[model samples]
Target: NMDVIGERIKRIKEEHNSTWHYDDENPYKTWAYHGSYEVKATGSASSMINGVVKLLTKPWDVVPMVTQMAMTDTTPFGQQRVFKEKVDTRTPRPLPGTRKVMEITAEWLWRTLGRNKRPRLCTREEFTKKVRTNAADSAKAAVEDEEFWKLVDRERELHKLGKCGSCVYNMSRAIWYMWLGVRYLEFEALGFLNEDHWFSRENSYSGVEGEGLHKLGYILRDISKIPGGAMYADDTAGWDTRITEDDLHNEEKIIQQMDPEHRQLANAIFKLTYQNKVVKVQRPTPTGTVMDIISRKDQRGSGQVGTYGLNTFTNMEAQLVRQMEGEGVLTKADLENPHLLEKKITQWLETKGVERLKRMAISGDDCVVKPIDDRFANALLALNDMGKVRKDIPQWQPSKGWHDWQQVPFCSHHFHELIMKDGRKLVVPCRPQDELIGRARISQGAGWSLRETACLGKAYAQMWSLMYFHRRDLRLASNAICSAVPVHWVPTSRTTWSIHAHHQWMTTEDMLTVWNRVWIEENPWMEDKTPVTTWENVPYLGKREDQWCGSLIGLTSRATWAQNIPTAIQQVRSLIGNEEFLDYM
Candidate 1:
């Protein structure tokens, strides 16, 4: 029986050489792939000789073709890795809505620097020889320690369990892989670098030939090439090393250092996503501790003409014209001549400035004229001439006085700065139309209240998809989330619930669909029937962590980056509505 089994094993090795296999460790049915292109097929001696003759006759054509074939395999698992090799070069389908920006940026780094780069895409046996050599090396290391082999022997039975005896024999071959070397392809190689240097240590020594091929390396090396192979719940994608704080701060510097063509390319490819431009604001929650709000730059009208993000100057001009039009300050004829719109806004600001000051003097609100910038400082001077500017208010220092706070949709709405009693600066509306317009944005569920829960829920749902896309890994990843109810729990409070099968393969379209349905479920924890929490019916909250689900606006406070988000939130409140801030509380 033993001899027959040994003969069968020998026949198996001699007859078949395959690249794909199933993962024995995972109980769930899943496939694993090893990037080996070794061939062990039957061939006549004459054909083998003819193959060599063809190779020798047209070495260049044969060699290049063979190299390409060796690097790629005939499976989707292998094909996806090759296709997604240079992610930055892939045609970017915009993942609509600002909520996805964070996860997308994080995934970009995960697919880039956090990836493994092998010397060759394809690996092979001389399988018996390689496995034996690996075993030999490890055996030599344990040569002095008899306990090592003894323990391995003693646990061999326990390890075998219900598995076959041949499984143990074959499993020894899987212990070590005799690869040439491992090279980590990191962010520096992506043109963004460390101080006084570009590229990683491996990239520097990879030489010109290897350097050219570095970007074309496998992101999911070996078995990880399998779909949903890297579905870990934790943030274990080497985020800290992949993109450092310095990398975030020195984006513009890195772009300038690149060649002009690459500079333009990097600018186009790396156009200020949430990765670099996260403004933090900590909004107070009902519980006393503030919600950490990391707000990103709104990408509305980005990369388009006459849009909110295209040109700040244009946005300011457009906003002024719109405000004037809404207030009946500019008629249809005045709007027809776009050239005169700037002069008309200037005239409107002059009258509105005096009217605002007259109102501020009677009201408790202390007001001051904020010039758009230094060039517009004359506007402040012009307003000062009308006794609108209070001398008691802080003087406008060129260095610190006129800090640019971004408007919600676009540009800096810095015409009249009113200091509230709480030391919060509110952008006072010049016309009743301004207040009406601001409040309208809030009432329509776009501002801080309803949109906050919707955005938060969508953000977490997308985050969940990113962590676990391969449906099998859902159990390990989403235990706490699965326990709440089903699909209705606010993503803010990750509780027990059964997520839908459709939640897998969450592309931007899927995310939008999920987002649309997610906000309708009532929060289980909150006293109010807020459709922000995850939709699930837990008889009672079992964990303290699971119960504290608040559908509040989580903002980031000061910790050092660009832009003051507390003031940014404050400006947004003035642009939107002040009452909405308290309404959520």
Candidate 2:
């Protein structure tokens, strides 16, 4: 069961720390849940283990793990990732920090390494006479396996150095493109094996009326309970996160089709990359990328629940190829031309929405019918006029706010005006400005980059988004019906900070109940140790109060960029740990 497994994994994080932005800051994130159908699988569990080891250990061959900034920009923690050389940190000798299996373990992949002990050799009478003894023996073996982590670290060192100057950015697309071909020739790829494909109600948006009624985007799924997939099967399961069966469809609903010329270019890299299995094929992304796990993060935690690097069929392309081929992975002919790989994949990555929507031309009437309200969305999608996709992207209107500049910044972004049937206009206070960080900046890590990270303004347009996404109600974008418990954000700083208080959605019941964070700007001053709120003996619940939820990320000026951010992160950890927040991460 996810619950039982979550309980166990939760404990492991309480001990060792994963190597992340928080080298020592906090604990792992709460393991969110997904229904079985929501979790997809690409390969069988039997073939997955050693295959994964092969993939994770491949980073050893790369001279240095750092890749181009373009590559860093597309990943989950793009902004936080520094593209500088190891010497940039002024750390030890000129070498990047080695990301090991143990560093990313005990957090998201806790289940694989944290599984219960295997059933021992026992007889019916012998077993009945030693229930307690057998169970203890089982647990001891599973944990002792933890020490073996050194071997994982030891083995990855064999490849030693990766000097490929290109970005690992589009590796996913490389693998994805190859997988599509491999899949097309199902009987020949993967040792004459085909990667499994994901099927859902209607997976693609570009297809006509009935084109993909069942033809979903080619994807992989994580199946089984605990180790391989979700544990919830019964209707009344008490899963905490709000994503339901319908929301997983967002997987297909949001993907735009691939461009035709783009597909042609991508095919070039998929062919004979083996270099006659001579010149070593440098895998773009490090093997640890599959093993990299983000902890103490909300919403982001949703993707980390399953096995390391588990995902849609296309996403795990490289792993599958390496697994089946072993040492003779990509060919000289395959990688000798990294340019073709970069170009085609880059195009494929940019307008997945366009390619997807363009595919609609295949079935005119069919494509235009399913969605009645936003058919124009498809129209805009064809031209790749992404900004025209309504306010779907978080960048909708964030240029205004009083939090940082002390006033709303001018925003000419939204190109529309409005009116009401009765000559009334929906008036809104200037949209909170600083929250536009995500909207204005690079990595849209959730809406932090979009929403400017904080808000204290009235009539804000996205206040509703708080309840919508905060609760994980995929309904809004996922377009499913989800009623709220009416959570609101009543403020602790309400009095003199009057201008900021009426932000209802954030002041909700769960706000402080779930978290109590204090934002520290620049310096590591005590964010107010005045005994704000206590956990009330709650297990796993830290210094939670209505003042904050999730991380107490201290915002130093973006001008300093990487400076003070780590310090602030570490500072907050010490802050929470002092308060004894068992679940601080």
Candidate 3:
């Protein structure tokens, strides 16, 4: 994200000759940090991956993919763990339009990450190995404790009586596995990072011939030697991964080894459905490695352009020109002179860009989550007379002037200037009033907050990074995000409670989709007859801490790698905002 933004700044200066303000010029305040990042993936590519996750895993049991409460698996140090009872299944649930239990079974991460084959139900042999290993580790740790040996004798007697056998075995594999869940989570997390960074995009690294083969493939569209596999045709003709008697397993399973070019083929299938929105359109592609094109459908005058994206360039000059002609933003004679049409298109893009910048400011009532960076990009294109004026966008700065009630410099410019020196200054948790609430709230309300914005952008940044990553493995992308989180400069809010109770909001899909939608589109939460809560439901409410639905998003505010969302809602209001932010896009 930093690189993209940094590169964009350099590109803008070199190409557009425009500069968005940085801290200094003469003394030239610059970063001295010598460290660099492991880049993987780009924003556009990650977006492609996001859609792929939705598809490849479509046949999966999505509901079970998420939450799994009522767990009662127990592990014996000798025998495998068995779920004697997942007793909570009988418990009452939070009903729709309210919190619930089955919601307990919703997603933990990534809108419920990748395909999960049911474990080959732990073989007795597998179970025995884990059990013995666990016992060995435990006994070694408790070696000095005489009481541990004493308890062992007591358990032995109970086991002989057959009365406490189950109790004794309860500490079996299940208990051992309980200790190992974190390791498993880390394991899954690593797997997810790999999928997001590498497999999702199908860019794998190699070792035998080393980096060159890997590096060469991404650039060279493999045309050599009929690509992948050996002895394919029964006529004993071509290349194939396997030639002799391939196992034809269950009809339900993957029968063949995947072709090496599968990734390229998958990547090739997606084209820009909308300017910024890429979707996979199966069948022979209209072009090599699908790209954005104005679909000349007869939607309006002279074969109009088709649909647009909700979060992408729906109104870019190039794309919007089609819509303009469709709606007659330009007419037959005006568009006929191609130069005039181009001239008119440029004019429209500038106006649209300006309009977008004007709308980036946050005011609480504004429910739409506008794409700040993209809009800013457009704003950059719209630039004309700012002349390096370098005023921060209204969103970046507070709307009100600071006032000192006392003779002291309380809440004054000097303090702001001090923060400004730090570059990414900490804006107050309070946002100026939007439609839903005031700048400072006594409690939680239905508005987007800074933490939410930070998390949202952070999520997108991961995607952006993954789209154009380095080293094939984007675990470095994960390393930066999931690494020991340094004292980060991005916005953060403690999740004191569930401002909204449903577990789905915290799901990766919801966090990404909802924030973008409510902010970019009208917030369904505040709209009529929605599953989400409205301001009317809790007229004076502020934040909610307890859904108690078995996820941390339900827990009170805490520093976390994921779902640090309460702050996003806390500072949602704004005094200066674009009333027509959603009008064009």
Candidate 4:
């Protein structure tokens, strides 16, 4: 079965571009995977035929279509959005209209009010407390306001449609107070309509935590300044707008413990608003397709693996030489002929310490130095402190290095010590300054925005999706590992459409390889263009070379491992494509 697919791929390659390779710079021209081209061509031919027939048969319908097209903004580019109005980006000074009304209403309700002094017409607590105290007068005042009645009647109609419940009654009361509660403060009172309630993660009022209420106030106040802004502002107030999953869940559970009428109000205020929306998003499974397919990128490939490998070789060079000399591989006669001794040492290390070398060569943990003996290091520390060798008498000790900066080396406190295979101890300094430097470098390269964080988070999700799939196999025994392999053929400047297409191609090919081939035969996706050493091709014969053993180890050695689950892998690709089509928002 595997042979059949290989033959078909070969035939397809020969028919199109036989000279194609994975690393071709212009893959659009050199791409050998032309299967989707046929699908597109077939659809285009069908649409072309259908359009002609439909044009002749439905000539009368063309008038309405033409009118619709004429009314539409036909200019293709440079238009920011469909909204003709400029957004009010300025901070909303208190509208004198609402404040005047509130000042007059307050005097009428509470007769002790004096000149140039206004009540604290701010939070939900103050609004409800004042209104409920003189309930009859408050109702009469709300009754006189036409705008307040209009706001109420609007909710009544939504209630009539069974889309709202008791929430309409409370929301009507809320609008009246907030509308008339705009005292001549720096901010508008309308913003505080749902300040405690909307931003709260609880069903019961627990007061504002952090800047949640402040941000809500800012957005609502600015939005309400726009003419005919109630459509946007009111909807925002009604939506279950908890930004985080934990907040949403906490609110849900709190509402679940409420009275039936209270729950009805919760649904009317938050849940109904969500249901009545034009667009809906369903719950999702990890599909890796659009999950950071292209986020921010580094300028070049993961650089020069040999640079780190060289460090590993040098680290163990002394140990390897001693081992070879003890084994009689390097005789005393060969000491004068240093080249021969070096040659034998290299050969012995290549044979015995290949995997040990590779483990040491892995990236991000190589910042180490051969440590001075404890006796010598302590003596230097004592000299620096007692003799004032670093601060006052700087020239006394030549080549003081870190001792030139302070009495003790900075590494003394921040370093981790580890003994290597050759009994050589290395002090790996973990300095905060190094972390600061790394973060600054990354910020400069990829940017240091919240969107950049979001992009990287989604890239991690992509790796998670693959690891999830890998772990689903019982053979992996709940352990799986994956790394993002960049789609090199696709240019970073291209849009997400091309990036995802290349991702789809690579993912499909990778899965196909997993389904059909064993791990040792996984040479096609091998990262290096050419081997630096011959041992790079050597198959793992035992657990010594692996990070894990048992089932995970067995997984690589198993023959035709995923051959029986061809349909499942196909479904995985289909699900990924379907999920990709669903807009992330």
Worst 10-residue lDDT window for candidate 4 reads 291-300
Ten contiguous residues minimizing lDDT sum, candidate 3: 232-241
* Per-residue alpha-carbon lDDT of candidate 1 for residues 1-585, written as tens digits (9 for 90 to 100): 232123323323343345222223311111111112222222111111112111111212223333332232423233234323321121112212211222222223223322343211111222224335434345344333455444433333322231111111110222211111100011111313321121232332111111111111111011122222111111111111122222232232334445554444334323322132221111212332221112122222121111111121111222222233335554444423324434445455555522311111000011112222233222222122111232344434211221222111111111223332333322221211222112111211122343343323333334443322111112111222122112332333121111112232223343323432432232111233322233122111112311122111122221211132233334434433334232110
**Model 3 TM-score relative to the real fold:** 0.16
For model 1 the local lDDT of residue 394 reads 43
Models 1 onward score TM values of: 0.16, 0.17, 0.16, 0.17
Off by over 4 Å in 2: 5-11, 14-585
**lDDT tens digits by residue: candidate 4, 194-287:** 3223222122111122222112222222222332201110001101111122212222232333355444444433333222211101111132
Error of 3 at 555 (Å): 35
Candidate 2: how large is its RMSD? 28.2
| lDDT for model 1 | 0.24
lDDT of 1 at 368: 18
How many clashes show up per model? 26, 54, 62, 0
Residue runs of model 4 more than 4 Å from their true location after superposition = 1-306, 325-452, 466-585
